[PDB]
Write a protein that binds this ligand. Structure first.
Ligand code: M1R
Ligand code: GDP
Ligand code: MG
Length: 167
């Protein structure tokens, strides 16, 4: 059975853990421990294909040991996550995409831009700002809520479709 190694990246507080746990365990977590970095497995079906998803929810501390490089490099696709009510988190996306390109030593790595917390009023990042960042990377943009499940399957599934295209 085909396995997909997906890595969820982005600033603290954007909902990497809440999206990963909504997908895998179908509930919404308040203030998940930001020190906990885990891998989560899920049998799913995308375009009629029963696949195994191996999903790394990144956490802890920013650090660049060989060992961290090697654990991130196992990633076949990346969710670049920001929160639509957090402009600083959107302005950090470029950093995560640069570190992805470095450890994969490639200008073409399957990625999806995810604008999370779309159930919230008082958005500070507009749809157009995030569609233009994603068009600048040649990658898709999907709007999610870890809380209502809006777009959650579609963000993960769209990343899988990106990895298939790369093959
Ligand atoms: C709140 C806890 C949490 O979820 N995380 C801690 C911060 N983590 C993290 N943060 C950054 O950068 C923070 C900002 C952005 C610009 C400079 N800095 C002030 N960068 C990374 C991480 C996780 C580890 N990262 C990393 C290490 C090695 C290789 C790669 C390759 C590809 C992507 C990331 C890599 C970078 C994580 C979340
Ligand atoms: N309303 C709402 N809150 C969210 C969403 N995603 C995450 N949160 C909350 O935002 C906070 C940070 O999310 P968390 O999953 O810890 O993000 P992480 O640090 O990137 O893993 C927690 O209190 C979450 O419950 C969302 O889509 N909508
Ligand atoms: Mg977390």
């Amino acid at each position: 059975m085909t396995e997909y190694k997906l890595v969820v990246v982005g600033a603290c507080g954007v909902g990497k853990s809440a999206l990963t746990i909504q997908l895998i365990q179908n509930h919404f977590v308040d203030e998940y421990d930001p020190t906990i970095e885990d891998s989560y497995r899920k049998q799913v079906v995308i375009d009629g294909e029963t696949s195994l998803l191996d999903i790394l929810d990144t956490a802890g501390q920013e650090e660049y040991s060989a060992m961290r490089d090697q654990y991130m490099r196992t990633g076949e696709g990346f969710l670049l996550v920001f929160a639509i009510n957090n402009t600083k988190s959107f302005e950090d996306i470029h950093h995560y995409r640069e570190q992805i390109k470095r450890v994969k030593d490639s200008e073409d790595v399957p990625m999806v831009l995810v604008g999370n917390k779309s159930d919230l009023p008082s958005r500070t990042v507009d749809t157009k700002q995030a569609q233009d960042l994603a068009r600048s990377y040649g990658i898709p943009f999907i709007e999610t809520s870890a809380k209502t499940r809006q777009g959650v399957d579609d963000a993960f599934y769209t990343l899988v479709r990106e990895i298939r295209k790369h093959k």
